[PDB]
Every structure is written in structure tokens, then in C-alpha cells.
Structure 1
């Protein structure tokens, strides 16, 4: 049974979150959670929280039994940018985009 959890409007680029996400993909939910705890990227926490929520979602809303779960699917798409300006030298004003992601985790037992 699939069962999934996601974080939309995550305040990280995507490129960065993906970096963490690829560590985890297709791992035993257990081994996933470990790889995350000991990864020093702020995305790690962002994605650990999803995995967790997702596992919880599994156990509570469906078959559960977190013993078999795998992160069978994880992919993060890019959310909207918040748009800003950077006062710069000689009156020039620069753009700058604060970027966000939508993290999606899908956990199951098959």
C-alpha cells in the first residue's frame, strides 16, 4: 500500500533538497532515517520530517507495520520563487530569487 507525505513550499531551492533526497531513495525506511540523522545539510532535516510524517501516515491511516516500509519513491519538484532586490553598487539594483521546493516522499512495503 503506497501512502505518502509531502512538504510544499519548503524554503530550500530543490537542487539542494534533491542532494539529500538521492541519498535516501529506495532505502529501507529504517536505513533511510539513519542516513538522514547523520547528514549535515539543512535539507536533511527538511526531508527527515517528511519521511517521518509519511511513515506515521502509513502506520496510522493504512496497513502500517513500519518494519517493512521502504522509501520506494522520493522526488522534489520546484515551488514558486519569492522575488526580491539587492541594492548594489552605483545605484544598480539586482534581482535575486528566494527559491522553494515541494518535497514528496512515498513510502510502502513493495
Structure 2
């Protein structure tokens, strides 16, 4: 019946380009190994992607009754969200735009 489970994180306050650089490491790897990868990569997006990947595992066994020991990661992508627009006062009475960008993170785990 159900072969895969997913979890998303809508509107996380991290720029999409910065979170997209850690996602590329865990694409195609087993869930046991991928969790360790995010543990030893000293970036700011690791605690966020780690907390999403674990959630996808959790409802992969409570909702669909899969095996935690036989899962891989097949789909993992980061989408853009509603950016916040701010300003920074520069010299000589001018102002400059600052974009506070958010992101959506999706992780899909399935049997192999």
C-alpha cells in the first residue's frame, strides 16, 4: 500500500541557498547514516534538516508501519517562501534593502 512517508517544514527562517548546501549531502543515503552526516557538519541548517528527517521517519513507522532499519532518503529539496523586506541606513541619507528570506524543506523516506 503506502511505500513512503514525507514531512515538510513551512516557513523556516533560513535562506534557501544556505540550506540547499547541506541537503545535497544526504540525498540517496540511508537514514541511519544520513542522521550522522547532519550531526558532524558544522552548519546552521543541520539542526533544522535533522529535525525534519527524524519526523519523516517517525510517521513512516507509526502511520504506515515500515522498518526503521530499511529506509533510505530518495527526495529532498528546499523551496522558497515569503521573504521579509527590511532596510539598512547607509551613508549620506540613503537606505539599502535587506531581504530576510525563508524556506520550505521536504524530506521523503522509503524502503529499498
Residue equivalent to 2:92: 90
Misfit runs of 4+, over 4 Å: none
TM, length-normalised to structure 2? 0.94
Residue equivalent to 1:49: 51
Q: Give the total of aligned pairs.
A: 110
Bigger share in strand: 2
Residue equivalent to 1:80: 82
Structure 1, unmatched stretches of 5+, are: none
What CA deviation, in whole Å up to 9, does each residue of 1:31-67 have, x standing for no partner? 1001011111110111000000110110111122111
Structure 2, unmatched stretches of 5+, are: none
Q: CA RMSD in A?
A: 0.8
What CA deviation, in whole Å up to 9, does each residue of 1:49-108 have, x standing for no partner? 000011011011112211111111101111110110111111101110000110000011
Residue equivalent to 2:19: 17
Bigger share in helix: 1
